[PDB]
Amino acid sequence: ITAYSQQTRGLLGCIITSLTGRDKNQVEGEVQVVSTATQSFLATCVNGVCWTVYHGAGSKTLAGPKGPITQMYTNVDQDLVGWQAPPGARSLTPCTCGSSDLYLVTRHADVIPVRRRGDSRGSLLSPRPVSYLKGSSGGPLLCPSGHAVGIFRAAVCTRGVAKAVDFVPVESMETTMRSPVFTDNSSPPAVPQSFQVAHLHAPTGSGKSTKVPAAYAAQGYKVLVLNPSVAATLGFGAYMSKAHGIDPNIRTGVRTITTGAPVTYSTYGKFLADGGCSGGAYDIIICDECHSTDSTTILGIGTVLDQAETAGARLVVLATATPPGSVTVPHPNIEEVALSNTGEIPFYGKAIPIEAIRGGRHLIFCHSKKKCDELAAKLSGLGINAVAYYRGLDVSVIPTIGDVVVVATDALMTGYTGDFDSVIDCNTCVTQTVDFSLDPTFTIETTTVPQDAVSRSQRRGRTGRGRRGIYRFVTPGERPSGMFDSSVLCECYDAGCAWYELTPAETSVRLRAYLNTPGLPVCQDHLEFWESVFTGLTHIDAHFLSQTKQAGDNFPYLVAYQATVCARAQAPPPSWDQMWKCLIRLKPTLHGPTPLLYRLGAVQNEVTLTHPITKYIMACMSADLEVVTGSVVIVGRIILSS
Amino acid sequence: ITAYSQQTRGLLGCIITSLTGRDKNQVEGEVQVVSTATQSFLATCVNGVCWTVYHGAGSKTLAGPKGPITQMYTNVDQDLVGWQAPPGARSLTPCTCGSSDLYLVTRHADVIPVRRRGDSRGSLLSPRPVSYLKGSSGGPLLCPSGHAVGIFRAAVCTRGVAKAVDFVPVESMETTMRSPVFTDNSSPPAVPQSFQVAHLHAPTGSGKSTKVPAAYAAQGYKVLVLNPSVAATLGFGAYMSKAHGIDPNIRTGVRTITTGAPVTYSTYGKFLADGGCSGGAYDIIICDECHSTDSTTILGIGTVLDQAETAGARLVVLATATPPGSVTVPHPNIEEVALSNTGEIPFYGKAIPIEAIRGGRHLIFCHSKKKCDELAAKLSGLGINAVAYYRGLDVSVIPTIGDVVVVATDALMTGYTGDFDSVIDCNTCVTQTVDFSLDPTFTIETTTVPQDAVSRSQRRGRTGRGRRGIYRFVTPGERPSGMFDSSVLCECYDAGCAWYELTPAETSVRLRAYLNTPGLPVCQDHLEFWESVFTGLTHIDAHFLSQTKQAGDNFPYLVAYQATVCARAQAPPPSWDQMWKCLIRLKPTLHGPTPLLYRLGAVQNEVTLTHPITKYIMACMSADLEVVTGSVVIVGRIILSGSGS
Ligand SMILES: [NH3+]Cc1ccc(Oc2ccccc2)cc1
Ligand SMILES: [NH3+]Cc1ccc(Oc2ccccc2)cc1
């Protein structure tokens, strides 16, 4: 095998084409170089279908001769997407009698030897920088005969040096093609003779966590319905007593009720607080909002999947309006309008007319609490009745009746259950992103990022509920949905220690149940990495753990454990911002360099690396780490020949 | 003082506008959010001129009502460029009485208080990560009265936190405006009565390395001519003695010759090897190729500027075809032709058709030695006589001579002096950047990047000499010339130690003479930081040093030092790349994590940061590092409050 690249489009055409969705150039070759507005990567044609990775492609359409091609196949559990191949596309053909010597075509037309180990794993003969492979997701792994063993999806790395490759085997495509491209998941499953995890995809309003649990209980089953939101968990209790004459049990941290009833409503949080499943309690477990990628939902859903075959249950139901890989589609009840630039109120580069929000009840989403208070002032300045809500504030700041503009962060989603005449969306959210920076260990950065399609649908779906709604937006983009960052896993272990007395090895078992169930959000497999680092975080100071839970910002356990080590060395904290207020009382006492374990923010101090734990963590970094490496547009192609 | 922002264009409207260079949208506001294809930053309109930083904007035009607006001012030393505001556009105005309370406006429309601490420095009352200030270059510092104090150009960092901001004081802008738009520099200067550093910007052709040094000799003056290339130096000498009559002294490593003549030709390397200026020696020194930013040319010119006046010289001419700021205009003699896809030979995305090169003499440039070899092999299949040249190989591996298609890296432009019928350029080169990654110390990465204007001009310069010439290219456009990376300073200290027995403190002085002389290539000033690093690198192993020196590769002193520490820890090197070949010999006896000092490449062994040297370098990192933080298109604006705070 031999290979060379050919650039077919430059920037302007790629943009123009992305928007029009009309690729008029004739698709020659069988490996294409593709681009989105942000990423560039490779797509291979096998068996008449043009394949690539989900983390690159998303749910995006392919620009084609007659306009946008929607995806024919979308397996988010195998990081696989595929479009029907435009007429005149050559295709590689599968590999019958696999060799072990493979050849990985990169986007620079370099052909890289690979030794096959697993079904989906290959080891690079000559290890290379991970940077080298980035751009080559969805490039084909070949055998010498030129046939197609699979498509590349991740590097497996030691300390930033790719030594193995992760690929999608060609049979997983053959499975994928064979799978029902449309499956029906709107009606609730019947209660099978033995254990079975089932899915329920139904829009909000289908009674997923009211009608259906009522159905199961009328059939005589004892039913637990798990939910992220306390406001929601509590709200069902009341709706039930009314519209189905069951006073159900309610279990929330704040306030629980045990009527004896066959149906229980519970927060995932409280579920975990009570040691998961009690054997004999329930026949059916409904996990609502399982598209949720907060640590408590993940850990909770993990637990249910881990425990319920044993606790006697016969049916787990993963219920959601927006499963991984789903596209934000028109709602028949919600007019969607773009914010423009002629309005009285600046809002994320655009403007809001004061007409649009004077009188009525409106919801303006912002990414940050700073920007909320800023906007809630501006509006009160203009005589509009504005109110900020975010993590911290109590939900009574939101008047339940009467005109108001609520400027909120996403906290609003789990904190408040009402709906609104309009919603204005800045179309962006803050997120936490772990970086294996080796300076000395890992870092957790905050970042404003484009909203994913799940968020857009949660946000927009706060208007239009059985009554008409306007949804105003700054921008039409979604990022693709149902993927989460490794830092979410990190948060689970932190949570496991902080709140639910779980040893890191028990958290792992539950996360591993989550990861190995198809149809959930996906995540690079870093369970062992994180387990190992938390394994080493021993003899924490209870009193510091206390104050970081109390204050309730993220990573209370890591923040406490740094805090701890800092105190066992009269050594000051990384910095004197809020995070390390739990030390203010010792400020004039501490002096020297900070014994740094990891970066959870700006470090403003001398730092020594010579602490035994820091070293343990650095040794944890030598772990194998799987890393990843408008329409999608074809910008170029790689031509194959040994 | 408060602010908010308006996005006035999308991503497509912005590409269309960069290419056409025509923007109709009224220019409202004072602070403009401008953008290139590659990046984005701020531009502030002051006294009717629309200013921004050179590092963002280069020499690019600015889209406007009737078409691209040409830069009125360009000061690559201040990092400052300016276009005439289209009539309409509001302007800020300067401060009328230095109040020290200041206010920086960021591209996120945040306004962040700054305490003025000198002519063009202010400290953040609240330190913040540098990443927060990125894309705010060209933004204004305002006094409390809302007047322009300066345009922000860089953050001063400790370990990635901005504690202070550097700006272009609006008085510098005042000078610039009250001054000529066009300057001469085209003609050789007359010799002054006392010391003076003149510039000379003239085409290769103006004989600035032969004609003008003759002229000065004809007037009875001793002139020394420094050049980076050793081929260029011997060739100028030869030409002189012959077509000019004076047998000139040559001073190069490969060939030294003392006639006694009044003209001496030399490379920068030999000059530096000879200890620089020997008192009395010369009156005029011509630094040809001052635009070069090889460590040797930078150290050499630094020495000349540091020593030339005390050595009794009267005139240093900094000589160059392409000074910082210069743009690639066309040629009378060179038709330039977009390479394209339809062609028998693949070449960086496009193809080269054979007919184009089947007969005659051709230079094909390639970003790397690998691609040269690979492309040689391919051209000797289709049966064209094609050599590959590059660093390592010998100059005479090229026919002088027959039919040929030479496939070269930039090494060509110092080794060889001949020209060609057509030149094919992939338009990209290989740089080194230093990243202060604190992992544990710093990284020197070798990257591939778009070529700058000088590069394009040199590469295209190898045709169209006194005849027709075709220029084929993979990509139009250049990045801006006259800026070099912090790694190049690193190379300078490294050569200082490796080659020229200069201690770091001595080197600082030479380089500081370079930096503070204006009209040369500019540079993030990291002198004290590197000086510190190399001061701590003591008791290097002479034998490793001599092997890395011989080897020809980069950072010989750093590679050999890293090797020294390893050998003496009986630890293996960070990899078994070619870079570490000097330790292969010893491979059996080397066990354990490597005691890592810095990163020059892929670390593969386990590492360990307990070495005293690691810690020393780690401490050096707490230094104060200044970090930078088609037409330019206005894509938005920041609006400032007219009253109140
Ligand atoms: N950036 C987060 C991210 C990126 C890629 C990704 O792909 C996967 C991972 C695991 C299984 C299947 C697909 C998951 C999460
Ligand atoms: N005030 C001197 C000055 C002028 C320009 C300059 O631009 C650069 C240089 C190097 C890298 C990035 C930008 C740096 C320093």
From Swiss-Prot, chain A:
Binding of Mg(2+) 1, residues: S209, E289
Binding residue positions for Zn(2+) 1: C95, C97, C143, H147
Superkingdom in the source lineage: Viruses
Motif window: DECH box: 288-291
Binding note for cofactor: Binds 1 zinc ion which has a structural role. The magnesium ion is essential for the helicase activity.
Names of required cofactors: Zn(2+); Mg(2+)
Intervals, Cytoplasmic compartment: 1-629
Domain Helicase ATP-binding, chain residue ranges per copy: 189-341
Residues of the Peptidase S29 domain: 1-180
Membrane topology, record value: Peripheral membrane protein
Binding site for ATP: A202, P203, T204, G205, S206, G207, K208, S209
Catalytic residues, chain numbering: H55, D79, S137
Residue stretches in coiled coil: none
Catalytic function, reaction form: Hydrolysis of four peptide bonds in the viral precursor polyprotein, commonly with Asp or Glu in the P6 position, Cys or Thr in P1 and Ser or Ala in P1'; a ribonucleoside 5'-triphosphate + H2O = a ribonucleoside 5'-diphosphate + phosphate + H(+); ATP + H2O = ADP + phosphate + H(+)
Positions of the UniProt region annotated as RNA-binding: 458-469
Subcellular location: Host endoplasmic reticulum membrane
Note on domains (UniProt): The N-terminal one-third of serine protease/helicase NS3 contains the protease activity. This region contains a zinc atom that does not belong to the active site, but may play a structural rather than a catalytic role. This region is essential for the activity of protease NS2, maybe by contributing to the folding of the latter. The NTPase/helicase activity is located in the twothirds C-terminus of NS3, this domain contains the NTPase and RNA-binding regions.
Record function comment: Displays three enzymatic activities: serine protease with a chymotrypsin-like fold, NTPase and RNA helicase. NS3 serine protease, in association with NS4A, is responsible for the cleavages of NS3-NS4A, NS4A-NS4B, NS4B-NS5A and NS5A-NS5B. The NS3/NS4A complex prevents phosphorylation of host IRF3, thus preventing the establishment of dsRNA induced antiviral state. The NS3/NS4A complex induces host amino acid transporter component SLC3A2, thus contributing to HCV propagation.
Quaternary structure and partners: Interacts with protease NS2. Interacts with non-structural protein 4A; this interaction stabilizes the folding of NS3 serine protease. NS3-NS4A interaction is essential for NS3 activation and allows membrane anchorage of the latter. NS3/NS4A complex also prevents phosphorylation of host IRF3, thus preventing the establishment of dsRNA induced antiviral state. Interacts with host MAVS; this interaction leads to the cleavage and inhibition of host MAVS. Interacts with host TICAM1; this interaction leads to the cleavage and inhibition of host TICAM1.
Name by which UniProt lists this protein: Serine protease/helicase NS3
Naturally occurring in which organism (per UniProt): Hepatitis C virus genotype 1b (isolate BK)
